[PDB]
């Protein structure tokens, strides 16, 4: 029952470093190379290197040589990937991946869940929630100037979910994320029913509710 | 029985194109990449590219990306390489060689054709054959050298033989030299007993096939 469990998400400043772990289970750790692959948001797959967990030998992708380090601890069957001199570009999900067979196999049948690493000069902040006024009509909330990802949106504590779109966050030149949640509702209940956004940002503990009206 | 076969030679003009071929056996055509390798006269081997016959997948050396185009004809199990906009620098021997397939190859270029000579000629000029005779004071009762000066010809090659092939031992036909002329010149020499000079005929047979020129020069003291 092969399993690869990675550490949790991270947030780092430029020039810093991050160390991701990958704990393996269900097979002889030393009998399979461990590879690392990342994926910048909305981008393709990018190989970073492998490590031979039985010897500690490594191969690093040309792109990252000089600021990437891969190690292991056979006792606890854990592989590590440290990425240093961090840049904004390095914002991505980092995966550990294991070949299907021994030695120099590149068929990645086993993957970790991934470890998101955000690299940014920004500091934690709470979102600025604003209403999207009705001119079928559309209601909505604007979650502005927040960091880091993620933020959740709910409408009326889950009472209203049909026709609800929470848009993928967008990173502004400020370095802060901003998204908008909208919902299409019949003009019938514009005056009858109330609408509010249960916006919540766990990192900065900002739970906020804004109600919308004409 | 051979696994790859190539024609002998091609005479071609600058700016033109030439299409070299490489006949393969079914055994090789089924499973091997077909590679082409350049060898300029006297220089080393240079890999051009290769092609997988089953798919016409191609790989190239960037230097030959525009010079060389690789194809195959499935019915004849023949690999082709077209060389475009020919120049003097494309004068060379081009080899065919197979490479095993798989998750990359494993052994290497284990079977080579015999190569096709390509000569790019702007002019066709036959040679002048002058005698290199042993002079007045050649030590009598010793060994003497005589030869033939094959001067001012273009393109290579010229074949030189002595007495229609009967005289081989000690023959030294030197590598051709390109002159400021832009023409080729060489000498073929042989050593013989001095006492044979008044008696035995010595003829150099110089053949320059580019101009279909056969010349027999008698070398007298």
């Amino acid at each position: 029952q092969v399993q690869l469990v990675q550490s949790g998400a991270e947030v780092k400043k430029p020039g810093a470093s991050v160390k991701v772990s990958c704990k393996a289970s269900g097979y002889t750790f030393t009998g399979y190379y461990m590879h690392w692959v990342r994926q910048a948001p909305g981008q393709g797959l990018e190989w970073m290197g492998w490590i031979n967990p039985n010897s500690g030998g490594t191969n690093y992708a040309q792109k990252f040589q000089g600021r990437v380090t891969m190690t292991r601890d056979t006792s606890i069957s854990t592989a590590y990937m440290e990425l240093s001199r961090l840049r904004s570009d390095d914002t991505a999900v980092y995966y550990c991946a294991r070949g299907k067979n021994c030695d120099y196999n590149w068929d990645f049948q086993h993957w970790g869940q991934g470890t998101l690493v955000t690299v940014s000069s920004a500091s934690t902040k709470g979102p600025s929630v604003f209403p999207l006024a009705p001119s079928t009509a559309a209601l909505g909330c604007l979650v502005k100037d927040y960091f880091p990802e993620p933020v959740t949106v709910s409408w009326n504590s889950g009472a209203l979910t049909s026709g609800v779109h929470t848009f993928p966050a967008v990173l502004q030149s400020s370095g802060l994320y901003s998204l908008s949640s909208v919902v299409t509702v019949p003009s019938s209940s514009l005056g009858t029913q109330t609408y509010i956004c249960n916006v919540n940002h766990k990192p900065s503990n900002t739970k906020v509710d804004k109600r919308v009206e004409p | 029985q051979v696994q790859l076969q190539q024609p002998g030679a091609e005479l071609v003009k600058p700016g033109a194109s030439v299409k070299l071929s490489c006949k393969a056996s079914a055994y090789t055509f089924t499973s091997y990449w077909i590679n082409w390798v350049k060898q300029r006269p006297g220089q080393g081997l240079e890999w051009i590219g290769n092609i997988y016959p089953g798919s016409s997948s191609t790989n190239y050396n960037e230097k030959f990306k525009t010079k060389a185009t690789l194809t195959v004809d499935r019915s004849s199990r023949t690999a082709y390489m077209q060389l475009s906009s020919l120049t003097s620098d494309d004068s060379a021997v081009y080899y065919c060689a197979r490479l095993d397939s798989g998750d990359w190859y494993y052994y290497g270029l284990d079977y080579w054709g015999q190569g096709t000579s390509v000569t790019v000629f702007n002019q066709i000029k036959g040679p002048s054959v002058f005698p290199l005779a042993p002079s007045s004071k050649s030590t009598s009762g010793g060994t003497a050298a005589l030869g033939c000066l094959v001067k001012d010809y273009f393109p290579e090659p010229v074949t030189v033989s002595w007495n229609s092939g009967a005289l081989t031992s000690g023959v030294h036909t030197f590598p051709a030299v390109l002159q400021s002329s832009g023409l080729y010149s060489l000498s073929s020499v042989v050593t013989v007993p001095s006492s044979s000079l008044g008696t035995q005929t010595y003829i150099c047979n110089v053949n320059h096939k580019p101009s279909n020129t056969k010349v027999d020069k008698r070398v007298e003291p």
């Binding site: 797959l45 299907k100 590149w106 991934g114 600025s128 604003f130 006024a133 848009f167 993928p168 909208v182 | -």
Partner: protein, 207 residues
């Protein structure tokens, strides 16, 4: 190095159709290749290894073929769960990917426009949102105009994923204006162009 060229970049098909993806390994003499499927929020999943071998638990409608360094992944009778991104792979190299998308009937966007909140103006900045809702295909060009002044560089778009039920998209384009730049302006508009619109549609409000 090896150069993997995956095609097509995007593929729009209906369920039950046959999808054909291609990958070309240039500058390589390897005749084997792997394919992966990736859905949003999850790691890639191995589909095919060694060009034609299926991985464990992969349905028989997934087939892989290779000839030389030319490879194809074929999906017969596309199931709804098969619409995702697909990657080829040789050694360390991954193809650019192929977004396999559900094709549905052209649907025009119901356009909505919102002026900046007044609380946002108490904060000191203004952002005007323009929404295109439930439309198909994904391609759409949105334009802003301040008092009939085609603006550029100060807009930001966001597009949802394809809806799992109706297979449409929604788009969020937000204009960020300085409160100093905004209140000193009259009429701002949002002009939408879409394949299911006869002519472009405009939505506006005076400040």
């Amino acid at each position: 190095e090896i150069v993997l060229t995956q095609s097509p970049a995007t593929l729009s098909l209906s369920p039950g159709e046959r999808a054909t993806l291609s990958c070309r390994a240039s500058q390589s003499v390897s005749s084997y290749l792997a394919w992966y499927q990736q859905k949003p929020g999850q790691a890639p999943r191995l589909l095919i290894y060694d060009a034609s071998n299926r991985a464990t638990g992969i349905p028989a409608r997934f087939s892989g073929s290779g000839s030389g360094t030319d490879f194809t992944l074929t999906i017969s009778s596309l199931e709804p769960e098969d619409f995702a991104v697909y990657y080829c792979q040789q050694y360390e190299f991954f193809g650019q990917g192929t977004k396999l998308e559900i094709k549905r009937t052209v649907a025009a966007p119901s356009v909505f426009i919102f002026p900046p909140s007044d609380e946002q103006l108490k904060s000191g900045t203004a952002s005007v949102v323009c929404l295109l809702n439930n439309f198909y295909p994904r391609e759409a060009k949105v334009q802003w105009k301040v008092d009939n002044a085609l603006q550029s560089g100060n807009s930001q778009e966001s597009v949802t994923e394809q809806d799992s039920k109706d297979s449409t998209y929604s788009l969020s384009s937000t204009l960020t204006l300085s409160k100093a730049d905004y209140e000193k302006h009259k009429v701002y508009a949002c002009e939408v162009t879409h394949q299911g619109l006869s002519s472009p549609v405009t939505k506006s409000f005076n400040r």
